[PDB]
Amino acid sequence: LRHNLSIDGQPLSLAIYAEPTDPKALLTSMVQASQGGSAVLPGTLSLYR
Amino acid sequence: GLDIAGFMTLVLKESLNANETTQLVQFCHVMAQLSLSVQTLRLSEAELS
């Protein structure tokens, strides 16, 4: 009587389902980087044409 | 305890070291560990840079 059950202890009020929050999806993206050139070496002038 | 200069000088030296060869292989194992950790974490080029 105190816990509001039946004669055999079965609950008189149906327990709520408590539907979960459920998982979510994941995402990824691209990443870039930048660089410069190398020092220009003075070409040793040959004799050819 | 090896810098890059000592690194390639002792590499070009034909393993003329008693324990500094052990130091060099420890250096190589450390770089291998770092590379494998980077591969496992999938750390990207720009992030590492």
**Please, how many helices of chain A?**
0
Largest sheet of chain A: none
**Beta-strand percentage range of chain A:** under 5%
Q: What is the percent of helical residues of chain A? A: under 10%
Protein name (chain B): XptA2 protein
Organism (chain B): Xenorhabdus nematophila (Achromobacter nematophilus)
SSE layout and pairings?
This is part of a larger assembly, with two copies of chain A (49 residues).
Chain A: no helix or strand
Short précis:
Chain A: This is XptA2 protein. Helix content of chain A is 0%, strand content 0%. With 49 residues, chain A is mostly loops.
Report what the structure shows.
The structure is cut from a larger assembly and holds two copies of chain A (49 residues). With 49 residues, chain A is low in regular secondary structure. Chain A has no helices and no strands. Chain A is rod-shaped. Chains A and B meet through loops of A and helix 3 of B.
Task: Offer a few descriptive terms.
0% helix, 2 chains, 49 residues, XptA2 protein (chain A), little secondary structure, part of a larger assembly
